[PDB]
Amino acid sequence: DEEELNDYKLRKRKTFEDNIRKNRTVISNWIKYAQWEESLKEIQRARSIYERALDVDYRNITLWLKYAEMEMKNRQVNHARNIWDRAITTLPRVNQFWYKYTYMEEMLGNVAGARQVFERWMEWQPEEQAWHSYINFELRYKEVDRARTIYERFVLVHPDVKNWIKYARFEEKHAYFAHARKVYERAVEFFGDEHMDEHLYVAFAKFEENQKEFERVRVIYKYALDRAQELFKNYTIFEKK
Amino acid sequence: GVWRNTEDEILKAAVMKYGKNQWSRIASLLHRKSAKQCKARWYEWLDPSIKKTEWSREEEEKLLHLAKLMPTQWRTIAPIIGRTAAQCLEHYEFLLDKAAKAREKQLEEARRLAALQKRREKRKRGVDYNAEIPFEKKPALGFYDTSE
Amino acid sequence: DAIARQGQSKDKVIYSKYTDLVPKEVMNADDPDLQRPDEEAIKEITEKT
Amino acid sequence: TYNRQNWEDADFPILCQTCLGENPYIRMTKEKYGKECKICARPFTVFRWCPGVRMRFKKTEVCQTCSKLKNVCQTCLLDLEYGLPIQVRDAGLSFKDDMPKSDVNKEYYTQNMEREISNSDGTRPVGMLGKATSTSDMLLKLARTTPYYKRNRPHICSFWVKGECKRGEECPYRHEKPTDPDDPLADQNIKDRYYGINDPVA
Amino acid sequence: MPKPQWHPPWKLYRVISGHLGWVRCIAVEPGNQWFVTGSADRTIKIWDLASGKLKLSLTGHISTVRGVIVSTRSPYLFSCGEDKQVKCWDLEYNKVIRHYHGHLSAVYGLDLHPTIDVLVTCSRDSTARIWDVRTKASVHTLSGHTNAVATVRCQAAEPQIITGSHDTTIRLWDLVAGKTRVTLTNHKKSVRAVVLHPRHYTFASGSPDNIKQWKFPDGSFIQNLSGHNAIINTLTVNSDGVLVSGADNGTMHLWDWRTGYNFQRVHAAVQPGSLDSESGIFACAFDQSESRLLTAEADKTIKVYREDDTATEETHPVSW
Ligand SMILES: [Zn+2]
Ligand SMILES: [Zn+2]
Ligand SMILES: [Zn+2]
């Protein structure tokens, strides 16, 4: 039975090598060969197959994803960390590598120093979901001054009215009312000061109505004097209250 | 030149199998029939785009008008009104009369049986994949790892 | 950057930081930074090559 | 279709002290692409010399890339630092290096290591020397200190074995009895000695 | 942000026809007496520069001629084609005298060293080859590109060889060792055109994503000329600082080299009987006087543009 299994493995490897040699650029043959080698419990053989496939074409996302998933499905954690470090240093613009690296080093790794590794992604100015996930990760690690610096760099790097509203809500939920008032004042001074966005003023009026109704009425009057229908609705709400 | 209904069914099945532009492949099936005969029989009678309906008032008015304009040119007249030349000629005559795998696996099993019989009783410059890694590419090392 | 270069020596330049991607400020036309390496060095490189 | 093993053409052969002989003045012969390598089968620069007075005219057998890879002599196939077989040194230090046996994989691996060495400084027996920092475990106990010149002795005259050497004392080959052919020490495959697999001396 | 200098706009003033294939390449004789076109007609035509009259037509190529260059220091004409052959024509007898041979696929372009008299060709087999001119010996085979190398540029200063290829990469090579030195991967699409500035020691690369200005010799990124989002096939630069980007959809853009400001968009018409899909700039070149722009349009025409002297600065003001 061992000789028959060896002949079957030799025939399967010969057909896989012939399919590789017939069409080199077809990566599905590489993926099927690597998964068949991993299914027969040959980790270093599948690692050599994946390294050959990455030498053939390193720009494919799925080769890195499958080779890192094969490293993570076994106990080779440091091999997976090396694979993710190479995938980050070659292809920084693929956010899926960053997301799966952070889920590997946060759930399975459980290392806070990976957040410093995450700061490498903060060199690259990613999309806003990275900033939101880092805000929620710093909240899950119970840090609020670090998250204040994160949201300040988010406002400086990606300035938006929704971003300033999220900064105001995060400063209100972290029990820093003076910092929330200073952030609302800076957003009124900078974000849409002459553009007349009429949405950060509504959030400042809501924060003032949470704080003091006279300042909320003054903010509603200033928003009505600077200006739409939402400003008139906020002025009617301030006059009714 | 006769056409039985059996030959019409065989021709319909051959058109639905082999497409349109093959005709000699179709005429291989039909005994005592040519490819030109099969093409003419398809395009004259058995095509499903042939309007096998009755003539409307507009169709008859256009047929009488175009027969007045271009006399006895039915291959030109017929694609204008959408019918074929024979149907429109017959209808024009009628209107004037009215107006008047396993084998390789078995071979591999037989070769394995012969190999076990010879073992119970060169390499052709190849690469043996079961003996070692065929093209060993070591993974790149960095910042981690204590082996296993 | 030691992840970026594996067996390649430090003479070969590798662009990997984010600061390689940002554009430089537009600068003066008459400036020795944006200048050719001049005729005697071009002639020396030409004769050596 | 444009990959092949490059021909290794270099001077200054890497030899042991024992096979080099004892005279400080050696007369030396070099062929540019004379023979092939006994392991990686590439053509290489073949060096031939007489180590002494009544020696054998020893010549280089393996190429310089294989000898720089395993840190061995080009003729004796023994280690430069200790004069031991490479099976003994691999049992002493590390036996997880290995090498392919099929010819296409062997040529591909040798071309890759040759390109790695040529992209390196030029004279370094890869990271295996980095695994060779720990030493003097037990290999220094049985290592030779004197140059064993008896392996530069000339071959046994086959005509004298059949008792028909008509040259007599003019014959440079040895007129003495050979070793026992029934002894398993007399097999000595060269590829087994290079790869460190079932060598009886080791 | 400095204000860009005002460049006068350009206008079409003659259209030359007579080729029976796509005109793929245009080269200008260094004495500015005539110019030369290679086509998909498997013919190479020498045209008078001033009168526009057809001076000569040469046959001998078996496929589409992709690149034609004239030697500045020898009376030689170098032509590369899709027939995997490079021909050195002696103009002294108007005959092919040398055959550079060894490329496995179609040659997409070529360039001459201005000082050493060595030839470099880029082909579809993902290789560039460096040939000695007199001995017809391929002294180097630059490899490392994973796709077809669309264009090659050559210069006397370091680095000598610039290659742009279809795998979104630009390789700055070293001439004496035959090895790559700098790899630039900033482009998202195929780099189809590179052009070198005559005096500022900088160069620019063209792709359908963007146009990118860099800095010799390290290849540091300088500027991102944006806009003109089409398949840019060609790139030439004036000595006065005017950069012309020609695309495969027929649109032409004109830029200031320094500020990267687009000041003119020219979309010429086609031949009288011609489809709208047959509008595309394959090559373009200035003359030696830097006053005529000659484009090889895909409707089998050569279109020649002149400066418009009647325009002034307030008539065509610079935006921002
Ligand atoms: Zn020795
Ligand atoms: Zn060797
Ligand atoms: Zn004898």
UniProtKB/Swiss-Prot annotation, chain A:
Each HAT repeat, start to end: 7-39, 41-73, 75-107, 109-140, 142-173, 175-210, 212-241
Known tissue expression: Widely expressed. Highly expressed in testis. Not detected in brain and lung.
Compartments in which it is found: Nucleus; Nucleus speckle
Subunit description: Identified in the spliceosome C complex. Present in a spliceosome complex assembled in vitro containing CRNKL1, HPRP8BP and SNRPB2. Component of the minor spliceosome, which splices U12-type introns. Isoform 2 seems to be predominant in the spliceosome complex. Interacts with PPIL2 (via the PPIase cyclophilin-type domain); they may form a trimeric complex with HSP90.
Family, similarity comment: Belongs to the crooked-neck family.
Role of this protein: Involved in pre-mRNA splicing process. As a component of the minor spliceosome, involved in the splicing of U12-type introns in pre-mRNAs.
The protein's name in its UniProt record: Crooked neck-like protein 1
Organism lineage: Eukaryota, Metazoa, Chordata, Craniata, Vertebrata
Gene behind this protein: CRNKL1
Section of the entire sequence shown: 216 to 461 of 848
Curated annotation (Swiss-Prot), chain C:
Role, per record: Involved in pre-mRNA splicing as component of the spliceosome. As a component of the minor spliceosome, involved in the splicing of U12-type introns in pre-mRNAs. Required for the specific splicing of CDKN1A pre-mRNA; the function probably involves the recruitment of U2AF2 to the mRNA. May recruit PPIL1 to the spliceosome. May be involved in cyclin-D1/CCND1 mRNA stability through the SNARP complex which associates with both the 3'end of the CCND1 gene and its mRNA. Involved in transcriptional regulation. (Microbial infection) Is recruited by HIV-1 Tat to Tat:P-TEFb:TAR RNA complexes and is involved in Tat transcription by recruitment of MYC, MEN1 and TRRAP to the HIV promoter.
Covalent link (Glycyl lysine isopeptide (Lys-Gly) (interchain with G-Cter in SUMO2)) residue numbers: K17, K24, K43
Listed name of the protein: SNW domain-containing protein 1
Protein family (similarity comment): Belongs to the SNW family.
Protein location: Nucleus
Whole-protein coverage range: 99 to 147 of 536
Signal sequence annotation: none
Curated annotation (Swiss-Prot), chain D:
Description of its domains: The C-terminal RRM domain and the zinc finger motif are necessary for RNA-binding.
Biological source species: Homo sapiens
Portion of the parent chain present: 9 to 210 of 420
Gene name, Swiss-Prot/TrEMBL: RBM22
Zinc finger (C3H1-type) residue numbers: 151-178
Superkingdom classification of source: Eukaryota
Record-given protein name: Pre-mRNA-splicing factor RBM22
Cross-link (Glycyl lysine isopeptide (Lys-Gly) (interchain with G-Cter in SUMO2)): K131, K141
Residues with the Phosphoserine modification: S94
Function: Required for pre-mRNA splicing as component of the activated spliceosome. Involved in the first step of pre-mRNA splicing. Binds directly to the internal stem-loop (ISL) domain of the U6 snRNA and to the pre-mRNA intron near the 5' splice site during the activation and catalytic phases of the spliceosome cycle. Involved in both translocations of the nuclear SLU7 to the cytoplasm and the cytosolic calcium-binding protein PDCD6 to the nucleus upon cellular stress responses.
Effect annotated for changing K162R: Accumulates in speckle-like structures
Family, per entry: Belongs to the SLT11 family.
Quaternary organization: Component of the pre-catalytic and catalytic spliceosome complexes. Component of the postcatalytic spliceosome P complex. Interacts with PDCD6; the interaction induces translocation of PDCD6 in the cytoplasm. Interacts with PPIL1.
Cell compartments where the protein resides: Nucleus; Cytoplasm
Coiled-coil segments on the chain, per record: none
UniProtKB/Swiss-Prot annotation, chain E:
Iron-sulfur in keyword set: no
BP GO terms, sorted: mRNA splicing, via spliceosome; positive regulation of G1/S transition of mitotic cell cycle; protein localization to nucleus
Subcellular location: Nucleus; Nucleus speckle
Keywords noted in UniProt: Acetylation, mRNA processing, mRNA splicing, Nucleus, Phosphoprotein, Repeat, Spliceosome, WD repeat
One term under GO cellular component: nucleus
Annotated positions of the Phosphoserine modification: S17, S207
WD repeats by residue range: 18-57, 60-99, 102-141, 144-183, 186-226, 227-265, 276-315
Presence of keyword Thylakoid: no
Subunit structure: Identified in the spliceosome C complex. Component of the PRP19-CDC5L splicing complex composed of a core complex comprising a homotetramer of PRPF19, CDC5L, PLRG1 and BCAS2, and at least three less stably associated proteins CTNNBL1, CWC15 and HSPA8. Interacts (via its WD40 repeat domain) directly with CDC5L (via its C-terminal); the interaction is required for mRNA splicing but not for spliceosome assembly. Component of the minor spliceosome, which splices U12-type introns. Within this complex, interacts with CRIPT. Also interacts directly in the complex with BCAS2 and PRPF19.
Function of the molecule: Involved in pre-mRNA splicing as component of the spliceosome. Component of the PRP19-CDC5L complex that forms an integral part of the spliceosome and is required for activating pre-mRNA splicing. As a component of the minor spliceosome, involved in the splicing of U12-type introns in pre-mRNAs.
Similarity section: Belongs to the WD repeat PRL1/PRL2 family.
